[PDB]
Amino acid sequence: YKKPKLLYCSNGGHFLRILPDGTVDGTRDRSDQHIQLQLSAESVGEVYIKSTETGQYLAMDTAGLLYGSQTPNEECLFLERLEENGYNTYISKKHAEKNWFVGLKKNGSCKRGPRTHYGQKAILFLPLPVS
Numbered sequence: 001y002k003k004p005k006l007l008y009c010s011n012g013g014h015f016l017r018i019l020p021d022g023t024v025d026g027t028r029d030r031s032d033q034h035i036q037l038q039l040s041a042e043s044v045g046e047v048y049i050k051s052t053e054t055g056q057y058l059a060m061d062t063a064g065l066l067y068g069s070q071t072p073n074e075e076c077l078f079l080e081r082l083e084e085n086g087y088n089t090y091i092s093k094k095h096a097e098k099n100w101f102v103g104l105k106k107n108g109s110c111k112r113g114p115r116t117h118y119g120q121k122a123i124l125f126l127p128l129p130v131s
Contacts, residue, residue, distance in 0.1 A: 001041040004052050006030075008126040010087060012106040016125065018051040018058060022068035026104035036130050039080075046093060047080045048072055060092045064100055064113025078102060087124035 007016035014026025015035040027035060036052045049058040056068035059075040069076055077093040090102040092113065100113030103122035111122050 001039050004036045004038045004130045006035055006128040007037055008128050009104040010124045011104055011121040012108055014104050014108045018056050018068040020054050024066040024068055024110050026108040045079055046077050048076055060113060066110045087126055089123050
């Protein structure tokens with residue numbers, strides 16, 4: 001919420017990526033044009049995560065799937081929490097009650113909401129400066 005950043009997942013070591021086709025996943029390549037994210041804080045602990053390259057917003061739908069939304073909406077807001085270990089976790093606001101976390105599998109694919117939970121390394125992200 002100031003300058004663009006990278007969201008590094010400690011699980012497989014991938015950077016969160018939102019592709020032009022709206023798909024979301026992780027990549028180990030730091031030169032990727034779609035891993036630079038701009039976070040903006042809506043309210044305290046509530047944030048939007050937007051791809052700087054395409055302007056698409058991270059979002060999670062009712063099926064628990066992550067997608068890239070061309071326009072911000074209710075499914076684009078995440079609860080950003082700072083873990084004691086130093087990593088952050090991002091919970092779906094719309095489904096906060098269900099504890100649906102943003103997460104990347106060791107193979108770099110995105111996890112589905114009900115299959116995430118506190119304890120997995122898949123849900124831990126390290127925001128890293130782009131510059």
